[PDB]
Amino acid sequence: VYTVGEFMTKKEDLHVVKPTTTVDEALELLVENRITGFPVIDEDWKLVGLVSDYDLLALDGKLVGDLMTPAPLVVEEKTNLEDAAKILLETKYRRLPVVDSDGKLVGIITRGNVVRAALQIK
């Protein structure tokens, strides 16, 4: 079987922030890195939240920790890719953080990554 860990955006090529990151640091990070959000880690690289441009710009002196959406839906590396694919493909979710046994964030799987996986079946 395929796993999320094989197709995920690995830890090396990630963009993360901490709850100590300022809204301006995060806005900067988004602008440079052409992303619309990041996973949010504590000092132990544990996953404590997710944050997006909508959250940053209060849409509808403050820090990511203030505006982040904490405790999100999560997958594992050994997680069968097809389950991840179901979620990605049947919900508003375009990303899912991948964490390990110790709750430590080790990647992210996007609907893109799933698409790429589908395509590289050849």
Place this chain on the structure above:
Amino acid sequence: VYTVGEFMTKKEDLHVVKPTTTVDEALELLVENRITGFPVIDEDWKLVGLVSDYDLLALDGKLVGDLMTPAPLVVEEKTNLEDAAKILLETKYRRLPVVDSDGKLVGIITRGNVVRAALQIK
């Protein structure tokens, strides 16, 4: 005043498709270019539609033209940036195509671009 044309993603750095583009070509383009959609142009570089991953993967032998969302909300280059900013910041829209007098697509303004603009005010 500021205009959209000053801060938009210009025509050079664009990614477009045509209605003749196949779903697989578009899926490829998305995977390489890390985008979640494109503007859709005819041969005259006129804007005829918009298309996204959700449309591509029929979510909820075919071509973009079949699945594209045509005739979307549009801005101009001389369009005062702040109006664009209002739309971007008060709606589900993260992108807006920029076209000229002849209806020809000459760029796109994203909420990102607006953010970058806000930041480079310094």
